[PDB]
Design a binder for this molecule. Structure first.
Ligand SMILES: NC(CC(=O)O)(CC(=O)O)C(=O)O
Ligand SMILES: NC(CC(=O)O)(CC(=O)O)C(=O)O
Lengths: 255, 255
């Protein structure tokens, strides 16, 4: 099949799960193999934040200094003294793959163990968060620390975005933030036909991991949730986004 | 494999889909082949009913005559001279597979063709109501009148019992009626381990059709959605409920 080809063509390993929520038509390809989830754990993080705070609640004055920053801070670097509220960090984590927002947010929710135990509670026995950013990308092959599967990660995304795990308000926020991500214009979004709406969170990590997790709406129907993950066998290996775009089109077509 | 062994052991074609609504792990087998659906449609019919009617609405007295009665009305034949409320006809419909009850309910929602359109609305592009009881069961092979599939019956059952297509009080009510069905102790019920709660809705048509659809809940863990359909090649063929129960055993093990 066309997924096996793309893996040869790109010298890379792919993981796919998509679900037509309106038909329970699926599309699977290594759906339970582990990949370092990378920055995609960011959506699920905000997933549990929103689960602990009303829309009203998410305006908390939260502060941080120069030292709290880490290795890539496109938004948090503008607002040292300024300070940013949960909303705006959730915006930054989600819209710009801000490493520091993720970290500061993660403290709010009580560290990677809590995240884990919360992920345990909704029904994800797979996603294994252990560390903050950037270290969390430090994943060697066969380790489970900070990995999940395509299945696990769509399902967690679905539960937050589209199930009863979140009230209307809080959920339209997630969808929104994600609908307007800046980072995935060459991932999932480049693989769906002109003018279907897309909410996505992307990731990159060592061993050439490039990941995208999305809900995507046609013009007519129920949304497809989907994770597309990939990796390579060289630690310092580089990724091709066009791996994901392509994968997605094979997903769309199949559905 | 496992399912095809059953198919040859019992000399019947099998239609199985199942979704672990916590993991999206699935069991499928001919999940998109079409079967005459028989009384299984009864649960979707009450799903639709509950979409349109309030609870107090369910107190209305429907009267009927010995003429309004068909060829298997185990409760409705006993109340011709006093009528029954809609609540009482739902019950009788669901728990005893009461045909007249279906025919009067089917009639309260706009007849087969309004039953199609509501099922199109939720996203069931497969299920195809056309007739009332008992003529709906008169389906020859090739025919798509009065057929649906495992993926579609199951998805549809899910929509009503679990999703957002009804409010929670109405879920609970559909679920309760379905938890107390009298007619399937020997099928899905008979194929799951002790302490697994089942709400299910059997059926049987010609060509030896024997179906069962259910939400089934383990002691701890998320609900599992479950259609098991079956048919055979000869038209006057008897069914065996051992087929549907042994097949469920395969689902529970696989799952
Ligand atoms: N921000 C990145 C990945 C990440 O930092 O998790 C850019 C990259 O590192 O290639 C993205 O495109 O999501
Ligand atoms: N209503 C039936 C089958 C049907 O008409 O769909 C009666 C029977 O078992 O013969 C049922 O009880 O499931």
């Amino acid at each position: 099949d066309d997924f096996a080809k793309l893996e040869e063509q790109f010298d890379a390993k792919l993981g796919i799960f998509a679900l037509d929520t309106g038909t329970n038509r699926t599309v699977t390809y290594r759906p339970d193999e582990r990949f370092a989830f990378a920055s995609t754990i960011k959506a699920l993080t905000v997933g549990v934040l929103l689960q602990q705070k009303s829309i009203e609640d998410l305006n908390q004055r939260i502060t941080y200094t120069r030292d709290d920053l880490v290795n890539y801070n496109p938004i948090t670097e503008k607002h040292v003294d300024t300070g940013m509220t949960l909303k705006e960090l959730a915006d930054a984590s989600l819209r710009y793959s801000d490493n520091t927002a993720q970290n500061l947010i993660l403290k709010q929710i009580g560290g990677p163990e809590s995240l884990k135990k919360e992920l345990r509670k909704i029904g994800d026995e797979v996603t294994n968060p252990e560390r903050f950013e950037p270290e969390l990308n430090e994943v060697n092959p066969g380790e489970t620390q900070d990995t999940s599967t395509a299945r696990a990660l769509a399902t967690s995304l679905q539960a937050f975005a589209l199930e009863d795990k979140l009230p209307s308000e809080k959920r339209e926020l997630l969808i929104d933030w994600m609908k307007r991500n800046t980072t995935g214009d060459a991932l999932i979004r480049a693989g769906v036909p002109e003018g279907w709406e897309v909410a996505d969170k992307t990731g990159a990590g060592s061993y050439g991991t490039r990941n995208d997790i999305a809900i995507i709406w046609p013009p007519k129907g129920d949304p497809v949730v989907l994770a597309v993950l990939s990796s390579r066998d060289k630690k310092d290996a580089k990724y091709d986004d066009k791996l994901i775009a392509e994968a997605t089109k094979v997903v769309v077509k199949a559905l």
